[PDB]
Amino acid sequence: MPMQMFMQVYDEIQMFLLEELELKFDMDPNRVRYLRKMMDTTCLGGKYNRGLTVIDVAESLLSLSPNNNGEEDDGARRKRVLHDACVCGWMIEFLQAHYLVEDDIMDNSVTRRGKPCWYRHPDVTVQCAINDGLLLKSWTHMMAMHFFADRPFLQDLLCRFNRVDYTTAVGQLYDVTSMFDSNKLDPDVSQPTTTDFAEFTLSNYKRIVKYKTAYYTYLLPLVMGLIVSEALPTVDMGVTEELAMLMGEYFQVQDDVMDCFTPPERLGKVGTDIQDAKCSWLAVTFLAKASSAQVAEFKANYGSGDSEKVATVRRLYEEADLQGDYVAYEAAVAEQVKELIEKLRLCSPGFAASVETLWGKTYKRQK
Amino acid sequence: MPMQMFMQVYDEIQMFLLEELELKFDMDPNRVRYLRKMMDTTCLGGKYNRGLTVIDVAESLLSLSPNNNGEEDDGARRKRVLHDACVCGWMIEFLQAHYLVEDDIMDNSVTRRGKPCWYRHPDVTVQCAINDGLLLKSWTHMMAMHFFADRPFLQDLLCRFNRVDYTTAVGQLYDVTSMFDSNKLDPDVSQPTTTDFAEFTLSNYKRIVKYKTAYYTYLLPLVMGLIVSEALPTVDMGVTEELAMLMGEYFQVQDDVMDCFTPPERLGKVGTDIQDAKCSWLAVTFLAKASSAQVAEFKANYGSGDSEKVATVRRLYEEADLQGDYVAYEAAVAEQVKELIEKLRLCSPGFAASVETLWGKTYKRQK
Ligand SMILES: O=P(O)(O)C(O)(Cc1cnc2ccccn12)P(=O)(O)O
Ligand SMILES: O=P(O)(O)C(O)(Cc1cnc2ccccn12)P(=O)(O)O
Ligand SMILES: [Mg+2]
Ligand SMILES: [Mg+2]
Ligand SMILES: [Mg+2]
Ligand SMILES: [Mg+2]
Ligand SMILES: [Mg+2]
Ligand SMILES: [Mg+2]
Numbered sequence: 101m102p103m104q105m106f107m108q109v110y111d112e113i114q115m116f117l118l119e120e121l122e123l124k125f126d127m128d129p130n131r132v133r134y135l136r137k138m139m140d141t142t143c144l145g146g147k148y149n150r151g152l153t154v155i156d157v158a159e160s161l162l163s164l165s166p167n168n169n170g171e172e173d174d175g176a177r178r179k180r181v182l183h184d185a186c187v188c189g190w191m192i193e194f195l196q197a198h199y200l201v202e203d204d205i206m207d208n209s210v211t212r213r214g215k216p217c218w219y220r221h222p223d224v225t226v227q228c229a230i231n232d233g234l235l236l237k238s239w240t241h242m243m244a245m246h247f248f249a250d251r252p253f254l255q256d257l258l259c260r261f262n263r264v265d266y267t268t269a270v271g272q273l274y275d276v277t278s279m280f281d282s283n284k285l286d287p288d289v290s291q292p293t294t295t296d297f298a299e300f301t302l303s304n305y306k307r308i309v310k311y312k313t314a315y316y317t318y319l320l321p322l323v324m325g326l327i328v329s330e331a332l333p334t335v336d337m338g339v340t341e342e343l344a345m346l347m348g349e350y351f352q353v354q355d356d357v358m359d360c361f362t363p364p365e366r367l368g369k370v371g372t373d374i375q376d377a378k379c380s381w382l383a384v385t386f387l388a389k390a391s392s393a394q395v396a397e398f399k400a401n402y403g404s405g406d407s408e409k410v411a412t413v414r415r416l417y418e419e420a421d422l423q424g425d426y427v428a429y430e431a432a433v434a435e436q437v438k439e440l441i442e443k444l445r446l447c448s449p450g451f452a453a454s455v456e457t458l459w460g461k462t463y464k465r466q467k
Numbered sequence: 468m469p470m471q472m473f474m475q476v477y478d479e480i481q482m483f484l485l486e487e488l489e490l491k492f493d494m495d496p497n498r499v500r501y502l503r504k505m506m507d508t509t510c511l512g513g514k515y516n517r518g519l520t521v522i523d524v525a526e527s528l529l530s531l532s533p534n535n536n537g538e539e540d541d542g543a544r545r546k547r548v549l550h551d552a553c554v555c556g557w558m559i560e561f562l563q564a565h566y567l568v569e570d571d572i573m574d575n576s577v578t579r580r581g582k583p584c585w586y587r588h589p590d591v592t593v594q595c596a597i598n599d600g601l602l603l604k605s606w607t608h609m610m611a612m613h614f615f616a617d618r619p620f621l622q623d624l625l626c627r628f629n630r631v632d633y634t635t636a637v638g639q640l641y642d643v644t645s646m647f648d649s650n651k652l653d654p655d656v657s658q659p660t661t662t663d664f665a666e667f668t669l670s671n672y673k674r675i676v677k678y679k680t681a682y683y684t685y686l687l688p689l690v691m692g693l694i695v696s697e698a699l700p701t702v703d704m705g706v707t708e709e710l711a712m713l714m715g716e717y718f719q720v721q722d723d724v725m726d727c728f729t730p731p732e733r734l735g736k737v738g739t740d741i742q743d744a745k746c747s748w749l750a751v752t753f754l755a756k757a758s759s760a761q762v763a764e765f766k767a768n769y770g771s772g773d774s775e776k777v778a779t780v781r782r783l784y785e786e787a788d789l790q791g792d793y794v795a796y797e798a799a800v801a802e803q804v805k806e807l808i809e810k811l812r813l814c815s816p817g818f819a820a821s822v823e824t825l826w827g828k829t830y831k832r833q834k
Contacts, residue, residue, distance in 0.1 A: 101787070102758055160759045454759040456663070464668060 102155050106148060109186035113243050114139060120242065138218070138232050139239070142197040143190075145213045149461055150196065150321040151189030153454070157325025158185035160454040167330055184328035187247045191240040191261065192321055198236035199268060199316075205229060206276065207376060213368045237265070253327050260327070264320045271312025278308055278379035279403075294377050294403060297387060305384045306349060314348020322455065335448045343440045343455055347462055350433045354465050356380040357426055360414065366467055374410050377403025382417050385425055394420065434463065469522050473515060476553040480610045481506060487609070505585070505599050506606070509564040510557075512580045516828060517563060517688045518556025524692020524821045525552035531817030534697060548696050554614045555691040558628065561607045562683060566635055568600035573643065574743060578736045604632070620694050627694070631687045638679025645675060645746035646770075660744070664754060664766065672751040673716065680722075681715020685825070692821065702815045710807045710822065714829055717800045721832050723748040724793055727781060733834075741780050744770020753787055761787065801830060 118136055121127045127135075158181050167177050203209070204217035205226060211217060219229030244261070248254045277285065279294040322340060326332040359371040360382055373380045383402075387395055398416055401409040417423075437459055444452035485503055488494045494502075525548050529537070537544045570576075571584035572593060578584060586596030608625070615621040644652065648661050689711060693699035726740045727749055740747045750769065754762060761783055768776035804826060812819035 101761075156758050156760075163760075453763060457759050457762070460665075460755075464670065466670070 102152055102159075103148065105182060106151060106155060106186055106189060109183060110144075110190060113187070113190050116246055117239055117242060120246075135235070138235070139194075139197075141215075141221075142201055142218050142232070142236060143193055145215070146193070147461070148189070148193065149458075150192040150317060151186075153321035153458055154189040154192065154325040154328070155182060155185045156454045156457055157322055157451065158182055158329050160450050161326065161329035161331040161334065164334075164450050165331075181328055184248070184251070185325060187243060188257070188324040188328055189321075191244055192316070192324065194236050194240045194243075195261075195265065195316060198233050198240075199272075201229060201233040201236060203272075205233075206272075209369055209372070211364070211369050215368075251328075253330065256332075257324070257327050260323055261320070264315045264323075267311050267315045268313075271308055271310070271315075274304075274308035275312050275379070278304065279377050297383075297399065297402075300379055300384050300387055302384050302388060305379060305381060308379065309349050309352040310345055313352040314345045317351060318344035318348040318458070322458070325454070326451075331451070335451050336444065339440055339443045340455075343437060343444075346433060346437050346440065347459065350430070350437075351462055351465070353381040353426070353429065354462075356382060358465075358467060360417065361423070362467065368467075372405075374413050375403060375405050381426075382422050386417055386420055386422055389425075390416065390420055469519055469526075470515070472549060473519065473522060473553055473556065476550065477510070477557060480554065480557050480606075483613060484606055484609055487613075502602065505602070506564075508582070508588075509568050509585050509599070509603060510560055512582070513560075513563075514834070515556065515560060516825075517684060518553075518560040520688035520821070520825050521556040521559065521691045521695070522549060522552040523824055524689060524818065525549055525696050527817045527821035528692065528696035528698045531820070532698075532701065532815060533817075536697070551615070551618070551695040552692065554610060555624070555695055556688070558607045558611055559683065559687050559691065561603055561610070562628075562632060562635075562687075565600050565603035565607070566639070566683075568596060568603060570639070572596060573639075574739060574745075576736065576739050578731075580735045620697065624691070624694055627690055628687065631682045631690075634678050634682045635680075638675060638677070638682070641675035642679050642745065645671060646744060660770065662766065664750075664762075664769075667746050667751045667754050669751050669755060672746055672748060675746060676716050676719040676748075677712055680719045681712050684718055685715040686711035688825070689822065693818070698818070702818050703811060706807055706811050707818075707822075710804055710811070710826075713800060713804050713807065714826060717797070717804075718829060718832070720748040720793070720796065721829075724790075725832075727784065728790075735834075741769055741777050742772050749784055749789055752792055753784055753789060756792070757783070757787055797830075 114136065117139075118132050121135065122129070122132055159178075162178055162181055166173060167181075200212065201218045204212060205219050209217050210220060218224060218232060219226045224232070240261070241258075244254070244258055248257060251257070278299060280292050281296065282299060284292040319341065322344065323332070326335060356373065356378075357380075358367055359369075359373045359380065362371070364370045373383075386398065390398065394416055398413065401412045401416075404410065441452055441455050441459065444455060481503070484506075485499050488502065489496075489499055529545060529548050534544070567579065568585050571579060572586050576584050577587060585591060585599065586593045588596075591599070607628075611621070611625060611628075615624060618624070645666050646660050647658055647666070648663075649666060686708060689707060690699065693702065723740065725734055726738050726747065729738075731737050739745075740749075750765075753765065757765065765780060765783055768779040771777070808819055808823055808826065811822060
């Protein structure tokens with residue numbers, strides 16, 4: 101049902117944008133075609149994990165103190181909240197859409213969702229792809245304003261949205277600057293490659309992971325479900341914030357691990373985090389426990405497309421039982437996520453349940 | 468023809484076991500009369516799909532790419548193999564009768580196959596029923612030793628056969644302990660049913676069905692077929708276990724679904740599973756696609772002798788469009804199962820057609 105609703109509003113959103121563009125922007129049907137296909141391609145074919153969350157949260161806070169006016173329960177709020185909930189859901193989805201479009205270019209990925217990255221479609225330049233990206237972020241604003249201009253929460257909605265928008269970009273700077281020694285970090289300064297791997301620290305890792313994934317993936321969807329429910333003050337931001345960060349860091353680590361050990365047929369993307377010399381969890385988790393010996397062979401094999409290097413990089417990781425360190429991680433995270441969510445239930449049992457469902461879609465995660 | 472020879476070997480095996488009981492174990496006619504009825508009630512009625520397959524695997528293999536060691540198309544081996552094939556089929560059919568006599572008590576079911584379960588029989592105490600099940604499994608060994616004495620494969624039949632026997636109890640343990648949190652599994656403290664239903668994952672489902680039903684339903688019949696026609700090396704096992712596993716998961720799922728929706732009439736019993744609150748395919752799939760709100764009510768009702776709460780479960784199953792997922796489940800299996808057969812059909816057509824008739828009698832399961 102929720103995906104039923106959710107998808108109904110997708111079609112609604114797509115129609116407004118596309119039609120707005122042609123009635124008020126002077127756009128030919130051709131380009132509209134392009135934009136219509138761009139949107140579909142980058143915005144559909146996913147989990148709708150973030151989108152679906154906002155809805156579940158919304159519809160879950162609905163029951164308790166349903167806004168509270170003068171009426172003996174009215175299903176006009178139930179309906180007005182889950183349309184809003186749906187729009188916010190899509191605001192999140194177009195937002196990630198934008199970042200993934202820009203990310204693949206950046207990470208130079210060649211595929212995603214079993215299909216080529218947007219910027220790798222035969223009929224798409226990268227120049228156009230970079231702006232298709234911008235377009236996706238702008239869509240989120242046209243749609244928020246188009247459907248929320250009469251909502252008293254619009255100011256708060258969009259302020260929290262853009263902060264998280266900003267937070268994810270900070271995260272991407274941390275991400276993208278994790279291969280070059282900070283002290284050198286200087287535009288005017290000739291291309292410092294990725295010599296020594298200091299700053300490939302768990303400390304350093306947690307921080308890029310937090311801002312680049314946790315917030316737009318776990319905090320933002322919950323927060324936005326609160327807001328369209330007018331139940332934001334209803335809930336402990338501290339606990340909530342603590343779970344999102346937790347859940348959000350465990351989720352990235354997962355894609356970091358799935359990146360190395362899951363088959364692309366399952367994954368979609370062809371794992372290259374190695375080759376890209378990415379600061380993945382395996383990477384930092386390895387170097388902190390790897391003998392002096394082990395750490396050398398890593399340094400000589402990491403960040404390379406050589407068919408015999410990566411494989412060796414998959415060996416040291418195997419060797420070192422990184423595969424085991426994960427499970428331990430996974431369980432610690434699991435313990436605290438459950439202690440945290442319990443603190444929630446007390447005061448916020450309605451809310452606390454949709455976090456659990458969110459935890460349900462994360463714990464599994466094998467894709 | 469197959470059912471023909473099949474049914475007279477039952478009378479053979481039964482002729483023998485009972486006389487061996489009367490001549491060798493000091494049994495009185497009163498008890499032989501008991502065991503005899505015990506054997507017919509619990510071993511007859513069904514459709515002998517397991518015990519018939521083995522014979523199809525046997526006839527096919529004795530033909531299409533048959534035994535080199537066999538002579539030049541002469542009716543002396545046909546008798547042995549097809550006979551052996553029958554003995555093997557009653558072994559697996561006796562195997563199931565054991566596991567059903569025990570499961571009914573465990574699962575606590577009122578009828579099976581249109582009749583009351585064995586332990587649900589007037590002069591059958593629950594206490595005698597447990598032993599009866601035990602006997603059922605001893606007979607499998609007795610008939611094997613008797614007929615396959617000379618048989619150069621006897622040790623291979625029995626070893627493998629016992630692997631699968633061991634693989635079903637394991638399965639049985641998986642099923643029977645998915646009602647509670649694995650973390651809190653310790654003989655010394657009270658066993659309270661889980662309220663979060665965390666253990667109901669597709670992945671967890673998958674495993675309790677692989678071991679509990681695929682191996683003896685789909686692999687054992689096959690493998691017996693091969694062994695008796697001394698053709699097992701000739702086939703790609705890896706592909707064979709794939710579809711045994713494929714077809715066996717599907718068969719259970721089918722069971723699981725029939726359990727909730729098939730009329731007890733067509734079905735052949737009352738629908739247990741919700742009351743019993745097991746980890747069936749439905750719950751696991753509902754639970755994974757349903758919302759916080761939906762889940763909470765399901766939670767409220769599921770696993771309770773009480774029609775009104777049972778009807779809800781049923782209600783948010785189909786209103787949760789669970790029959791669409793099934794159909795969509797069927798097709799994927801049918802697709803994938805349809806590729807492996809021709810993968811098997813390559814270096815061993817003969818087996819592949821026999822496997823195709825087992826598929827043939829699985830896809831269209833209307834019983
Ligand atoms: O491409 P993926 O899915 O493998 C990847 O994990 C994507 C990802 C995570 N967080 C962000 C934030 C902005 C843009 C992309 N993001 P990563 O950052 O490793 O490329
Ligand atoms: O009672 P049924 O026939 O519906 C049931 O399907 C019984 C069943 C299936 N597979 C096994 C394996 C061992 C013992 C019993 N088994 P279930 O497991 O659903 O209880
Ligand atoms: Mg990337
Ligand atoms: Mg990246
Ligand atoms: Mg990644
Ligand atoms: Mg059972
Ligand atoms: Mg049962
Ligand atoms: Mg059943």
